[PDB]
Design a protein around this ligand. Structure first.
Ligand SMILES: Cc1cc2nc3c(=O)[nH]c(=O)nc-3n(C[C@H](O)[C@H](O)[C@H](O)COP(=O)(O)O)c2cc1C
Ligand SMILES: Cc1cc2nc3c(=O)[nH]c(=O)nc-3n(C[C@H](O)[C@H](O)[C@H](O)COP(=O)(O)O)c2cc1C
Lengths: 202, 207
């Protein structure tokens, strides 16, 4: 409640939520919100049990948001059989949330190559040696094998399984704290002609 | 940009020692967070799922840590409430930027008796009662001013209101948890617990 938190969209109801999304992220970066792109990303298994973890949104796309992960991780396995996902951004400084609902699709390997090459190279060793989310049987062995690759110069090859997902959005909500506890919820839903928009009760 | 910003020391001896009882690790971490001044440590990004297994998320606050798990309150008619009533399975993550810690909490949410919900409602500062009484959380809001005006009328009272129908307390009774620390040299420290027939199985996970 500590930085300014303007929400004129709640009055004016903009037609295109992708444009609001881009505006909120720009405002977050320029006012210096701490890790605004840390998304709590929910997926579910074949019984419909949810799982969560943080991932970083690396781009906004025409259809949604983009992140990278490993295909054999829990989220990658869930996504493979059930593409429906939801993520939330929560910015403590302005008391704002963004809720993002949709289906995530794995992008082609060339896109993954590029994502990999644009990471700081210090991240290649461990992300190459680790099989994300599998049982870790020997900590020291992993540390030693990664140190072997850390010593090398330049980028490493993209490991099989390193992959990029686009979460193509079917609904979003923008949430602000409002006045007198009337929290402001702007809710958008894709239609076959564009986007529908409504306010929700707090 | 993909970088974490945490700089506070965050001792994670439990990654080496593998305590048998994961709720002790949850208590340690939460108490550490309290002592070092983490901002809103208990803002929980909670996921539930609809009848087709499609997830939804929002932040709720963990109001208590119980023997079985963690407690929060909400409205039974909300999206999360309707989802939990049909599919009790849920997952929440806490993430603390200052220490680079994450806590993932998975299990089944059970609605606790009304006496519990009465208690929880009463413990709320009564200033929160007016808006929570007039709002049917997550249904469309047709007229913002009518809502504001109606709460303001109730706020005249300057005291506790009766608990609304729908106001409720869920306990998330945990079946699995992960404690995640940044570790050294990007070997992120992942301590994973899963309920057994008695006690818990524990393992480490690859970063
Ligand atoms: C701030 C933060 C950002 C993270 N960003 C990513 C990311 O973008 N991609 C990723 O695979 N894991 C990321 N992780 C690690 C994930 O939370 C998780 O440990 C890993 O992806 C395995 O999740 P899973 O076992 O649920 O599939 C991040 C962790 C933290 C705490
Ligand atoms: C910091 C913060 C804490 C919140 N705590 C709660 C809470 O504990 N209980 C609750 O019902 N909603 C809480 N909310 C509001 C929810 O995020 C959400 O707007 C509301 O519960 C409706 O969720 P739903 O439509 O997905 O069911 C909180 C919001 C913020 C940003």
């Amino acid at each position: 409640g500590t930085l300014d938190a303007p929400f004129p969209e709640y009055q004016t109801l903009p037609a295109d939520p992708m444009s609001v999304l881009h505006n909120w992220l720009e405002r977050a970066r320029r006012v210096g919100i701490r890790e605004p792109r840390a998304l709590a990303l929910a997926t579910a298994d074949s019984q419909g049990r949810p799982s969560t973890r943080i991932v970083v949104i690396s781009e906004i796309s025409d259809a949604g948001v983009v992140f990278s992960t490993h295909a054999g991780s829990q989220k990658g396995r869930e996504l493979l059989h059930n593409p429906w996902a939801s993520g939330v951004l929560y910015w403590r400084e302005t008391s704002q949330q963004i809720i993002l609902n949709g289906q995530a699709v794995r992008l082609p390997n060339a896109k993954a190559d590029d994502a990999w090459l644009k990471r700081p190279y210090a991240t290649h060793p461990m992300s190459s040696v680790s099989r994300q989310s599998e049982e870790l049987q020997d900590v020291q062995a992993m540390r030693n094998a990664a140190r072997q690759l850390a010593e090398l110069q330049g980028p490493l090859p993209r490991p099989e399984g390193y992959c990029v997902f686009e979460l193509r959005l079917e609904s979003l909500e923008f949430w602000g704290n409002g006045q007198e506890r009337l929290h402001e919820r702007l809710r958008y839903d894709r239609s076959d002609t564009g986007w529908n928009v409504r306010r929700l009760q707090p």
